[PDB]
């Protein structure tokens, strides 16, 4: 049981094919044909018809559902040598079931049973008798001695080639013919071609031909779209380029394809439009990688070797040992050759050494591409509401067809020809485009978005963006510009007679001007450039340093300084340290957040507590600087053991000019917006108040005293009010605290309140969170999802990738310039993050408003299309019923003209423009709600009332009498004319009545296309009805009408339109928008 062993599969059964005689249709259907031929040797024709229909349907049934295919064609067996096909039952969240072939190849005297499912290999291990995916050494149990031990592959590596495969993406794009063949067997297209075959049987020639051409066109267009999408995915593949590889104890040139795990390679500067081959791990040398893809930020990291680490005891952790790993798909700006000699010869090229770990689809970028392409979830996969809706429509059609049959039998008509009319009605009621509705809307919305440089990776998240309950933001990098102006240094003097004193430049002693030079991460590249964080470059320029090609940055007019070794910065550790050396001696510099640096240095200044609070109150951003003298490879807790103060850094943060308006629009558009930052709560509260998240006074939570006693104290921003709280005993007083202040919560108080009962009551009212570590952001977003509110997070950098992934819809704002993109587009004419579900290249923050508007428009357009299709189908069915009751029937030209005059409106209707300003009314999801059913049923009631009235009128003018053996021949008659024109006018009126309202997208008068189409079609229908022009009526074979009849015919249609408009307007006014949540209410203080 459960032969295949992998987290993808759930259960499997082996299969073996069967011959044609064993097939479930060919052999059992012979006796039926035999008895049919015996009985034959009129009414007997329908028997052969239904038998051929059942046969041709059974022949196609297997391709629809794979379980049916396995049950029909294949027989289950337990012999693993006999089996030639295997079925795979997938787990709930991974793809869908399928049938895959089992292949056999003999190598080294041993046969190997292997197949490939979802581009993830398998193999047959004899001792365990199970199918198991290949697993790499890094994942299971790394031994840091083995990595340094490895010396490269040698000998015949054929088994490895079989087990791990070629190291490249394998995405085949099929030909147009194969894809159209795959589409042809779909149930919907088969249903449509059967419907057209009926009309061909009913002697409708031109109508059927036009319908068939339209069907073919639609299918071809869909196939072109899908092929374009598959072609677009392939761009993530990288063209193989040559690197050197250590095989057979010497260096040989190989391509990127021939790479396997644990195989030595030498990487150089990444060529243009290329990246690192696969997931490496450094063994010697250095590099400067740019995690632009995975992380989403351009700041370059620094990677070092693994050689210095102890080999025996340590285990490769991928935690503190992350500086070695080099992910696949990130450009490496520079590499430095190995310093010292080792047993293995130097690389012929200047690159540093590396060891391979994973290849192909199992790397990070590769696994993400696989999940994006194959295991993605389609929009509305369940598709239950549409089936219930279609069952509703079929019930109505059966109600009509029963009366059709009764009247047809009563009027003497032959049943052999009446059953075809009944089937025509029943198959005519059904709208085919209904299940494939929302997909086209989402694709149109994506195409509209991509014009604003907002690229989408996973499309099925768009309907979530329509109705978002709460949306959260990051502070620096998202709401605040990237350029940072330097104000000055403060608090460096010890006397501190003035709290707000600034030493601009060259007024501080040598200590601090050396400190800022030592504690930096900038580096000058080979060709000559400077790459680093903008804040750091700004401060280093303003102070007056200059960085050279080597590590030594000098020529500041004060000496020559060089950096020996540096420690990496982290989010969880708010501190960065570097060790430097001067012409005289050696020291150590540290630079980090003030609250944490206060707990490290030895001499606590007298005004240290007060200066940074007094400066943080108004906008500024502050960092601390401390240095310690150190006499001549060591740990980390020794350099940051105890330090000495040197001064503060005070930066100013300029708001993005776009940030002010979007937040106001979101506050007025029935959304609640909160902030999640990293800085101390003073700057957070200040920016939140300047943008418009919090209006009045705000309260802050934090530790009460220096002792870690876990007691939280509500304290005002200006220290005027102090209110104590305890996590064990006291509980929040709603009226005293939450109504008056709208408190802001620090990360520490969130850590202490873990497990509390009123935690979820607290997380309702707070709008601002400060000093949170990346794990706490994930916790916050998961809790907000848990309460039932859908979320949106717009994040700047790698600080919050975990939070971005958890949100229902996430955006990553990559920094960019409009002029740079224009120049790049011009260069491309003259001649890709994958970090979050969505990506935006422009630095502006309007992308949130843009994507919300587009999602809302997609939803509301889906609703409109549902209603319009349903009503048109019902009207057509009942009109055909009323005609087919008697003997009369349409002509070919009349039906074809109706088809064209409706397709003209179909073409124009989809074109529309969204309103710029968002509206409070949020559209509800789901087919079944009071609005849709009420509107549809009432409009249909008015339509059938008018139709019954005019039918009674026409029967009263001319009476019909039962003639034996009626035959539905076309001839001009009052009934034909009246019903044809009423059908046309009402099918046109449904569009004009149910076009989507103003508050969401636009009015009807704004767009000229649909307006001119509707006015022209109504003018044509009227001029046909009011006999204004004789050539039109005489040329289309309409009977001349009585002067008394035309007045009633026109007035009933006019009143019908007005009644439909009135009812639809009432229902829209009353039951359209669902109520906003409780969290998003703009309560006053
Ligand atoms: N290279 C660096 N060196 C020293 N201190 C740094 C630093 N980078 C950040 N800090 C300090 O650590 C604190 C927390 O860092 P963190 O990255 O979590 O927040 P942040 O403001 O830098 C990004 P965001 O605003 O998106 O949350 C920062 O406020 C800053 O005081």
PDB file of N, CA and C in Angstrom, residues 157-242:
ATOM      1  N   UNK A 157      30.427   8.865 -13.975  1.00  0.00           N
ATOM      2  CA  UNK A 157      29.267   9.349 -13.231  1.00  0.00           C
ATOM      3  C   UNK A 157      27.981   9.197 -14.044  1.00  0.00           C
ATOM      4  N   UNK A 158      27.656   7.949 -14.379  1.00  0.00           N
ATOM      5  CA  UNK A 158      26.416   7.690 -15.102  1.00  0.00           C
ATOM      6  C   UNK A 158      25.235   7.531 -14.148  1.00  0.00           C
ATOM      7  N   UNK A 159      25.437   6.823 -13.033  1.00  0.00           N
ATOM      8  CA  UNK A 159      24.378   6.685 -12.041  1.00  0.00           C
ATOM      9  C   UNK A 159      23.956   8.043 -11.502  1.00  0.00           C
ATOM     10  N   UNK A 160      24.916   8.947 -11.314  1.00  0.00           N
ATOM     11  CA  UNK A 160      24.585  10.292 -10.862  1.00  0.00           C
ATOM     12  C   UNK A 160      23.774  11.032 -11.914  1.00  0.00           C
ATOM     13  N   UNK A 161      24.173  10.914 -13.183  1.00  0.00           N
ATOM     14  CA  UNK A 161      23.405  11.523 -14.262  1.00  0.00           C
ATOM     15  C   UNK A 161      21.972  11.023 -14.254  1.00  0.00           C
ATOM     16  N   UNK A 162      21.778   9.738 -13.955  1.00  0.00           N
ATOM     17  CA  UNK A 162      20.425   9.191 -13.913  1.00  0.00           C
ATOM     18  C   UNK A 162      19.659   9.692 -12.697  1.00  0.00           C
ATOM     19  N   UNK A 163      20.336   9.812 -11.557  1.00  0.00           N
ATOM     20  CA  UNK A 163      19.637  10.094 -10.309  1.00  0.00           C
ATOM     21  C   UNK A 163      19.267  11.567 -10.192  1.00  0.00           C
ATOM     22  N   UNK A 164      20.212  12.465 -10.464  1.00  0.00           N
ATOM     23  CA  UNK A 164      19.974  13.892 -10.277  1.00  0.00           C
ATOM     24  C   UNK A 164      19.609  14.625 -11.558  1.00  0.00           C
ATOM     25  N   UNK A 165      20.023  14.121 -12.715  1.00  0.00           N
ATOM     26  CA  UNK A 165      19.621  14.704 -13.980  1.00  0.00           C
ATOM     27  C   UNK A 165      20.412  15.945 -14.347  1.00  0.00           C
ATOM     28  N   UNK A 166      20.079  16.487 -15.515  1.00  0.00           N
ATOM     29  CA  UNK A 166      20.741  17.692 -15.994  1.00  0.00           C
ATOM     30  C   UNK A 166      20.355  18.890 -15.140  1.00  0.00           C
ATOM     31  N   UNK A 167      21.295  19.821 -14.985  1.00  0.00           N
ATOM     32  CA  UNK A 167      21.117  20.977 -14.108  1.00  0.00           C
ATOM     33  C   UNK A 167      20.639  22.172 -14.927  1.00  0.00           C
ATOM     34  N   UNK A 168      19.347  22.164 -15.241  1.00  0.00           N
ATOM     35  CA  UNK A 168      18.715  23.276 -15.941  1.00  0.00           C
ATOM     36  C   UNK A 168      17.211  23.069 -15.918  1.00  0.00           C
ATOM     37  N   UNK A 169      16.481  24.172 -16.054  1.00  0.00           N
ATOM     38  CA  UNK A 169      15.032  24.096 -16.152  1.00  0.00           C
ATOM     39  C   UNK A 169      14.636  23.368 -17.429  1.00  0.00           C
ATOM     40  N   UNK A 170      13.561  22.586 -17.353  1.00  0.00           N
ATOM     41  CA  UNK A 170      13.075  21.801 -18.490  1.00  0.00           C
ATOM     42  C   UNK A 170      11.608  22.150 -18.713  1.00  0.00           C
ATOM     43  N   UNK A 171      11.364  23.208 -19.478  1.00  0.00           N
ATOM     44  CA  UNK A 171      10.006  23.662 -19.765  1.00  0.00           C
ATOM     45  C   UNK A 171       9.758  23.560 -21.264  1.00  0.00           C
ATOM     46  N   UNK A 172       9.003  22.568 -21.730  1.00  0.00           N
ATOM     47  CA  UNK A 172       8.681  22.495 -23.157  1.00  0.00           C
ATOM     48  C   UNK A 172       7.384  23.216 -23.478  1.00  0.00           C
ATOM     49  N   UNK A 173       7.422  24.007 -24.541  1.00  0.00           N
ATOM     50  CA  UNK A 173       6.245  24.707 -25.046  1.00  0.00           C
ATOM     51  C   UNK A 173       5.712  23.931 -26.246  1.00  0.00           C
ATOM     52  N   UNK A 174       4.501  23.391 -26.178  1.00  0.00           N
ATOM     53  CA  UNK A 174       4.009  22.529 -27.253  1.00  0.00           C
ATOM     54  C   UNK A 174       3.593  23.329 -28.476  1.00  0.00           C
ATOM     55  N   UNK A 175       3.470  22.615 -29.590  1.00  0.00           N
ATOM     56  CA  UNK A 175       3.018  23.233 -30.824  1.00  0.00           C
ATOM     57  C   UNK A 175       1.543  23.607 -30.726  1.00  0.00           C
ATOM     58  N   UNK A 176       1.115  24.470 -31.646  1.00  0.00           N
ATOM     59  CA  UNK A 176      -0.269  24.931 -31.648  1.00  0.00           C
ATOM     60  C   UNK A 176      -1.234  23.779 -31.892  1.00  0.00           C
ATOM     61  N   UNK A 177      -0.845  22.829 -32.743  1.00  0.00           N
ATOM     62  CA  UNK A 177      -1.732  21.718 -33.071  1.00  0.00           C
ATOM     63  C   UNK A 177      -2.003  20.845 -31.854  1.00  0.00           C
ATOM     64  N   UNK A 178      -0.957  20.483 -31.107  1.00  0.00           N
ATOM     65  CA  UNK A 178      -1.146  19.625 -29.941  1.00  0.00           C
ATOM     66  C   UNK A 178      -2.003  20.310 -28.886  1.00  0.00           C
ATOM     67  N   UNK A 179      -1.799  21.610 -28.688  1.00  0.00           N
ATOM     68  CA  UNK A 179      -2.575  22.325 -27.683  1.00  0.00           C
ATOM     69  C   UNK A 179      -4.037  22.443 -28.097  1.00  0.00           C
ATOM     70  N   UNK A 180      -4.300  22.717 -29.377  1.00  0.00           N
ATOM     71  CA  UNK A 180      -5.690  22.764 -29.816  1.00  0.00           C
ATOM     72  C   UNK A 180      -6.343  21.389 -29.749  1.00  0.00           C
ATOM     73  N   UNK A 181      -5.584  20.326 -30.022  1.00  0.00           N
ATOM     74  CA  UNK A 181      -6.122  18.980 -29.862  1.00  0.00           C
ATOM     75  C   UNK A 181      -6.489  18.711 -28.411  1.00  0.00           C
ATOM     76  N   UNK A 182      -5.647  19.156 -27.478  1.00  0.00           N
ATOM     77  CA  UNK A 182      -5.968  18.988 -26.065  1.00  0.00           C
ATOM     78  C   UNK A 182      -7.204  19.790 -25.679  1.00  0.00           C
ATOM     79  N   UNK A 183      -7.385  20.969 -26.280  1.00  0.00           N
ATOM     80  CA  UNK A 183      -8.546  21.795 -25.950  1.00  0.00           C
ATOM     81  C   UNK A 183      -9.835  21.258 -26.561  1.00  0.00           C
ATOM     82  N   UNK A 184      -9.747  20.576 -27.702  1.00  0.00           N
ATOM     83  CA  UNK A 184     -10.956  20.174 -28.417  1.00  0.00           C
ATOM     84  C   UNK A 184     -11.804  19.205 -27.602  1.00  0.00           C
ATOM     85  N   UNK A 185     -11.166  18.340 -26.808  1.00  0.00           N
ATOM     86  CA  UNK A 185     -11.893  17.308 -26.072  1.00  0.00           C
ATOM     87  C   UNK A 185     -12.529  17.841 -24.797  1.00  0.00           C
ATOM     88  N   UNK A 186     -12.342  19.121 -24.486  1.00  0.00           N
ATOM     89  CA  UNK A 186     -12.938  19.688 -23.288  1.00  0.00           C
ATOM     90  C   UNK A 186     -14.460  19.570 -23.349  1.00  0.00           C
ATOM     91  N   UNK A 187     -15.122  19.412 -22.202  1.00  0.00           N
ATOM     92  CA  UNK A 187     -16.579  19.213 -22.231  1.00  0.00           C
ATOM     93  C   UNK A 187     -17.340  20.396 -22.796  1.00  0.00           C
ATOM     94  N   UNK A 188     -16.867  21.613 -22.541  1.00  0.00           N
ATOM     95  CA  UNK A 188     -17.612  22.797 -22.949  1.00  0.00           C
ATOM     96  C   UNK A 188     -17.636  22.931 -24.470  1.00  0.00           C
ATOM     97  N   UNK A 189     -16.484  22.739 -25.116  1.00  0.00           N
ATOM     98  CA  UNK A 189     -16.431  22.840 -26.570  1.00  0.00           C
ATOM     99  C   UNK A 189     -17.230  21.726 -27.234  1.00  0.00           C
ATOM    100  N   UNK A 190     -17.192  20.520 -26.667  1.00  0.00           N
ATOM    101  CA  UNK A 190     -17.997  19.430 -27.207  1.00  0.00           C
ATOM    102  C   UNK A 190     -19.479  19.761 -27.092  1.00  0.00           C
ATOM    103  N   UNK A 191     -19.889  20.328 -25.958  1.00  0.00           N
ATOM    104  CA  UNK A 191     -21.282  20.727 -25.808  1.00  0.00           C
ATOM    105  C   UNK A 191     -21.672  21.764 -26.851  1.00  0.00           C
ATOM    106  N   UNK A 192     -20.795  22.734 -27.105  1.00  0.00           N
ATOM    107  CA  UNK A 192     -21.128  23.769 -28.080  1.00  0.00           C
ATOM    108  C   UNK A 192     -21.226  23.199 -29.491  1.00  0.00           C
ATOM    109  N   UNK A 193     -20.332  22.274 -29.850  1.00  0.00           N
ATOM    110  CA  UNK A 193     -20.404  21.721 -31.199  1.00  0.00           C
ATOM    111  C   UNK A 193     -21.623  20.817 -31.339  1.00  0.00           C
ATOM    112  N   UNK A 194     -22.045  20.161 -30.257  1.00  0.00           N
ATOM    113  CA  UNK A 194     -23.291  19.402 -30.305  1.00  0.00           C
ATOM    114  C   UNK A 194     -24.487  20.327 -30.496  1.00  0.00           C
ATOM    115  N   UNK A 195     -24.490  21.459 -29.791  1.00  0.00           N
ATOM    116  CA  UNK A 195     -25.568  22.423 -29.956  1.00  0.00           C
ATOM    117  C   UNK A 195     -25.635  22.931 -31.391  1.00  0.00           C
ATOM    118  N   UNK A 196     -24.480  23.167 -32.016  1.00  0.00           N
ATOM    119  CA  UNK A 196     -24.478  23.621 -33.407  1.00  0.00           C
ATOM    120  C   UNK A 196     -24.923  22.501 -34.345  1.00  0.00           C
ATOM    121  N   UNK A 197     -24.578  21.253 -34.017  1.00  0.00           N
ATOM    122  CA  UNK A 197     -25.043  20.131 -34.823  1.00  0.00           C
ATOM    123  C   UNK A 197     -26.560  20.036 -34.819  1.00  0.00           C
ATOM    124  N   UNK A 198     -27.194  20.335 -33.686  1.00  0.00           N
ATOM    125  CA  UNK A 198     -28.656  20.369 -33.673  1.00  0.00           C
ATOM    126  C   UNK A 198     -29.198  21.382 -34.679  1.00  0.00           C
ATOM    127  N   UNK A 199     -28.676  22.609 -34.658  1.00  0.00           N
ATOM    128  CA  UNK A 199     -29.174  23.629 -35.575  1.00  0.00           C
ATOM    129  C   UNK A 199     -28.947  23.227 -37.025  1.00  0.00           C
ATOM    130  N   UNK A 200     -27.803  22.603 -37.324  1.00  0.00           N
ATOM    131  CA  UNK A 200     -27.628  22.035 -38.661  1.00  0.00           C
ATOM    132  C   UNK A 200     -28.706  21.014 -38.981  1.00  0.00           C
ATOM    133  N   UNK A 201     -29.111  20.218 -37.993  1.00  0.00           N
ATOM    134  CA  UNK A 201     -30.172  19.248 -38.239  1.00  0.00           C
ATOM    135  C   UNK A 201     -31.503  19.939 -38.500  1.00  0.00           C
ATOM    136  N   UNK A 202     -31.717  21.109 -37.902  1.00  0.00           N
ATOM    137  CA  UNK A 202     -32.967  21.846 -38.041  1.00  0.00           C
ATOM    138  C   UNK A 202     -32.996  22.746 -39.276  1.00  0.00           C
ATOM    139  N   UNK A 203     -32.122  22.499 -40.253  1.00  0.00           N
ATOM    140  CA  UNK A 203     -32.087  23.211 -41.530  1.00  0.00           C
ATOM    141  C   UNK A 203     -31.715  24.686 -41.393  1.00  0.00           C
ATOM    142  N   UNK A 204     -31.156  25.094 -40.258  1.00  0.00           N
ATOM    143  CA  UNK A 204     -30.572  26.424 -40.110  1.00  0.00           C
ATOM    144  C   UNK A 204     -29.130  26.355 -40.596  1.00  0.00           C
ATOM    145  N   UNK A 205     -28.865  26.900 -41.780  1.00  0.00           N
ATOM    146  CA  UNK A 205     -27.543  26.744 -42.382  1.00  0.00           C
ATOM    147  C   UNK A 205     -26.614  27.909 -42.051  1.00  0.00           C
ATOM    148  N   UNK A 206     -26.987  29.125 -42.455  1.00  0.00           N
ATOM    149  CA  UNK A 206     -26.103  30.266 -42.243  1.00  0.00           C
ATOM    150  C   UNK A 206     -25.923  30.554 -40.759  1.00  0.00           C
ATOM    151  N   UNK A 207     -26.987  30.386 -39.975  1.00  0.00           N
ATOM    152  CA  UNK A 207     -26.891  30.581 -38.533  1.00  0.00           C
ATOM    153  C   UNK A 207     -25.859  29.644 -37.924  1.00  0.00           C
ATOM    154  N   UNK A 208     -25.964  28.355 -38.239  1.00  0.00           N
ATOM    155  CA  UNK A 208     -25.017  27.383 -37.713  1.00  0.00           C
ATOM    156  C   UNK A 208     -23.600  27.698 -38.160  1.00  0.00           C
ATOM    157  N   UNK A 209     -23.425  28.088 -39.425  1.00  0.00           N
ATOM    158  CA  UNK A 209     -22.081  28.366 -39.923  1.00  0.00           C
ATOM    159  C   UNK A 209     -21.454  29.551 -39.196  1.00  0.00           C
ATOM    160  N   UNK A 210     -22.219  30.628 -39.018  1.00  0.00           N
ATOM    161  CA  UNK A 210     -21.713  31.795 -38.303  1.00  0.00           C
ATOM    162  C   UNK A 210     -21.363  31.443 -36.859  1.00  0.00           C
ATOM    163  N   UNK A 211     -22.246  30.700 -36.189  1.00  0.00           N
ATOM    164  CA  UNK A 211     -21.972  30.280 -34.820  1.00  0.00           C
ATOM    165  C   UNK A 211     -20.694  29.452 -34.743  1.00  0.00           C
ATOM    166  N   UNK A 212     -20.508  28.536 -35.694  1.00  0.00           N
ATOM    167  CA  UNK A 212     -19.338  27.667 -35.683  1.00  0.00           C
ATOM    168  C   UNK A 212     -18.059  28.465 -35.896  1.00  0.00           C
ATOM    169  N   UNK A 213     -18.093  29.435 -36.813  1.00  0.00           N
ATOM    170  CA  UNK A 213     -16.926  30.286 -37.015  1.00  0.00           C
ATOM    171  C   UNK A 213     -16.573  31.043 -35.742  1.00  0.00           C
ATOM    172  N   UNK A 214     -17.581  31.585 -35.056  1.00  0.00           N
ATOM    173  CA  UNK A 214     -17.303  32.311 -33.820  1.00  0.00           C
ATOM    174  C   UNK A 214     -16.692  31.397 -32.763  1.00  0.00           C
ATOM    175  N   UNK A 215     -17.206  30.169 -32.647  1.00  0.00           N
ATOM    176  CA  UNK A 215     -16.665  29.219 -31.672  1.00  0.00           C
ATOM    177  C   UNK A 215     -15.198  28.924 -31.968  1.00  0.00           C
ATOM    178  N   UNK A 216     -14.890  28.647 -33.238  1.00  0.00           N
ATOM    179  CA  UNK A 216     -13.510  28.359 -33.618  1.00  0.00           C
ATOM    180  C   UNK A 216     -12.608  29.541 -33.289  1.00  0.00           C
ATOM    181  N   UNK A 217     -13.076  30.760 -33.569  1.00  0.00           N
ATOM    182  CA  UNK A 217     -12.265  31.940 -33.282  1.00  0.00           C
ATOM    183  C   UNK A 217     -11.965  32.054 -31.794  1.00  0.00           C
ATOM    184  N   UNK A 218     -12.988  31.875 -30.955  1.00  0.00           N
ATOM    185  CA  UNK A 218     -12.778  31.986 -29.515  1.00  0.00           C
ATOM    186  C   UNK A 218     -11.772  30.953 -29.020  1.00  0.00           C
ATOM    187  N   UNK A 219     -11.892  29.709 -29.492  1.00  0.00           N
ATOM    188  CA  UNK A 219     -10.967  28.676 -29.032  1.00  0.00           C
ATOM    189  C   UNK A 219      -9.539  28.964 -29.478  1.00  0.00           C
ATOM    190  N   UNK A 220      -9.363  29.404 -30.725  1.00  0.00           N
ATOM    191  CA  UNK A 220      -8.023  29.738 -31.191  1.00  0.00           C
ATOM    192  C   UNK A 220      -7.422  30.869 -30.369  1.00  0.00           C
ATOM    193  N   UNK A 221      -8.227  31.881 -30.037  1.00  0.00           N
ATOM    194  CA  UNK A 221      -7.711  32.989 -29.238  1.00  0.00           C
ATOM    195  C   UNK A 221      -7.272  32.518 -27.856  1.00  0.00           C
ATOM    196  N   UNK A 222      -8.073  31.658 -27.221  1.00  0.00           N
ATOM    197  CA  UNK A 222      -7.685  31.144 -25.911  1.00  0.00           C
ATOM    198  C   UNK A 222      -6.375  30.367 -25.986  1.00  0.00           C
ATOM    199  N   UNK A 223      -6.203  29.561 -27.035  1.00  0.00           N
ATOM    200  CA  UNK A 223      -4.972  28.785 -27.150  1.00  0.00           C
ATOM    201  C   UNK A 223      -3.770  29.701 -27.367  1.00  0.00           C
ATOM    202  N   UNK A 224      -3.923  30.747 -28.189  1.00  0.00           N
ATOM    203  CA  UNK A 224      -2.825  31.700 -28.346  1.00  0.00           C
ATOM    204  C   UNK A 224      -2.461  32.349 -27.019  1.00  0.00           C
ATOM    205  N   UNK A 225      -3.465  32.717 -26.221  1.00  0.00           N
ATOM    206  CA  UNK A 225      -3.181  33.332 -24.926  1.00  0.00           C
ATOM    207  C   UNK A 225      -2.384  32.390 -24.029  1.00  0.00           C
ATOM    208  N   UNK A 226      -2.819  31.131 -23.937  1.00  0.00           N
ATOM    209  CA  UNK A 226      -2.121  30.182 -23.070  1.00  0.00           C
ATOM    210  C   UNK A 226      -0.694  29.940 -23.549  1.00  0.00           C
ATOM    211  N   UNK A 227      -0.499  29.866 -24.868  1.00  0.00           N
ATOM    212  CA  UNK A 227       0.848  29.677 -25.395  1.00  0.00           C
ATOM    213  C   UNK A 227       1.730  30.880 -25.085  1.00  0.00           C
ATOM    214  N   UNK A 228       1.170  32.088 -25.182  1.00  0.00           N
ATOM    215  CA  UNK A 228       1.925  33.282 -24.814  1.00  0.00           C
ATOM    216  C   UNK A 228       2.338  33.239 -23.350  1.00  0.00           C
ATOM    217  N   UNK A 229       1.435  32.801 -22.472  1.00  0.00           N
ATOM    218  CA  UNK A 229       1.775  32.715 -21.053  1.00  0.00           C
ATOM    219  C   UNK A 229       2.919  31.733 -20.817  1.00  0.00           C
ATOM    220  N   UNK A 230       2.823  30.538 -21.409  1.00  0.00           N
ATOM    221  CA  UNK A 230       3.900  29.562 -21.254  1.00  0.00           C
ATOM    222  C   UNK A 230       5.218  30.097 -21.795  1.00  0.00           C
ATOM    223  N   UNK A 231       5.171  30.862 -22.887  1.00  0.00           N
ATOM    224  CA  UNK A 231       6.395  31.470 -23.398  1.00  0.00           C
ATOM    225  C   UNK A 231       6.941  32.504 -22.420  1.00  0.00           C
ATOM    226  N   UNK A 232       6.052  33.231 -21.742  1.00  0.00           N
ATOM    227  CA  UNK A 232       6.495  34.240 -20.783  1.00  0.00           C
ATOM    228  C   UNK A 232       7.176  33.607 -19.577  1.00  0.00           C
ATOM    229  N   UNK A 233       6.710  32.432 -19.147  1.00  0.00           N
ATOM    230  CA  UNK A 233       7.362  31.775 -18.014  1.00  0.00           C
ATOM    231  C   UNK A 233       8.812  31.416 -18.312  1.00  0.00           C
ATOM    232  N   UNK A 234       9.122  31.062 -19.559  1.00  0.00           N
ATOM    233  CA  UNK A 234      10.444  30.534 -19.876  1.00  0.00           C
ATOM    234  C   UNK A 234      11.554  31.564 -19.708  1.00  0.00           C
ATOM    235  N   UNK A 235      11.220  32.850 -19.571  1.00  0.00           N
ATOM    236  CA  UNK A 235      12.260  33.873 -19.493  1.00  0.00           C
ATOM    237  C   UNK A 235      13.112  33.729 -18.239  1.00  0.00           C
ATOM    238  N   UNK A 236      12.581  33.094 -17.192  1.00  0.00           N
ATOM    239  CA  UNK A 236      13.374  32.895 -15.983  1.00  0.00           C
ATOM    240  C   UNK A 236      14.515  31.914 -16.217  1.00  0.00           C
ATOM    241  N   UNK A 237      14.420  31.095 -17.260  1.00  0.00           N
ATOM    242  CA  UNK A 237      15.528  30.227 -17.612  1.00  0.00           C
ATOM    243  C   UNK A 237      16.719  31.030 -18.103  1.00  0.00           C
ATOM    244  N   UNK A 238      17.914  30.567 -17.746  1.00  0.00           N
ATOM    245  CA  UNK A 238      19.159  31.249 -18.074  1.00  0.00           C
ATOM    246  C   UNK A 238      19.921  30.423 -19.099  1.00  0.00           C
ATOM    247  N   UNK A 239      20.494  31.103 -20.087  1.00  0.00           N
ATOM    248  CA  UNK A 239      21.220  30.410 -21.137  1.00  0.00           C
ATOM    249  C   UNK A 239      22.505  29.805 -20.579  1.00  0.00           C
ATOM    250  N   UNK A 240      22.797  28.547 -20.900  1.00  0.00           N
ATOM    251  CA  UNK A 240      24.000  27.910 -20.357  1.00  0.00           C
ATOM    252  C   UNK A 240      25.267  28.590 -20.845  1.00  0.00           C
ATOM    253  N   UNK A 241      26.136  28.934 -19.897  1.00  0.00           N
ATOM    254  CA  UNK A 241      27.425  29.532 -20.202  1.00  0.00           C
ATOM    255  C   UNK A 241      28.520  28.752 -19.489  1.00  0.00           C
ATOM    256  N   UNK A 242      29.726  28.835 -20.039  1.00  0.00           N
ATOM    257  CA  UNK A 242      30.795  27.922 -19.665  1.00  0.00           C
ATOM    258  C   UNK A 242      31.526  28.385 -18.412  1.00  0.00           C
TER     259      UNK A 242
END
